Copies of this chain bind each other. A is one copy, B any other.
Amino acid sequence: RREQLMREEAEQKRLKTVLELQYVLDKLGDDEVRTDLKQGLNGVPILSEEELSLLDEFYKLVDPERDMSLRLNEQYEHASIHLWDLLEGKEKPVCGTTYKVLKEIVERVFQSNYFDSTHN
């Protein structure tokens, strides 16, 4: 009963994390953003180029281009699982690494607070 409320909160918080992630992944398309992350603040990098490439590959998996052989209700089945696995930080293979490693990367990006400022 209260475990119900707790599960509902966890699911909402999970959605919030998904939205944050989508925002970040979208911003990783900007060359200026990639530059800022690879160098860091005072010389201390947030991402290596290697980790950045891992995020690019993951980006393709969770934001797929529309495939004409797939109906709408099918298009995001795999993406939904990729997203869920990342949030859980699963010890499962993806992008030549694991969701656990990808989650650790995302956490460092989130926690760097780079994206707490807006940059237009």
Contact = CB atoms under 8 A, between A and B. Distances in A.
Interface residues of A, number: 32
Contacts of A23: 66, 72, 75-76
Given A14-B11, A18-B15, A66-B118, A110 B72 contact: yes
Contacts of A77: 16
29 contacts: A7-B7, A11-B14, A12-B80, A12-B81, A12-B84, A13-B80, A15-B18, A15-B76, A15-B84, A16-B77, A16-B79, A19-B75, A19-B76, A19-B79, A19-B80, A20-B72, A20-B73, A20-B76, A23-B66, A23-B72, A23-B75, A23-B76, A24-B72, A66-B118, A68-B118, A71-B113, A72-B110, A72-B115, A72-B116
Given A20-B73, A71-B116, 13 more contacts: A7-B7, A11-B14, A11-B84, A13-B80, A15-B76, A15-B83, A15-B84, A16-B76, A16-B80, A20-B75, A24-B72, A72-B110, A73-B110
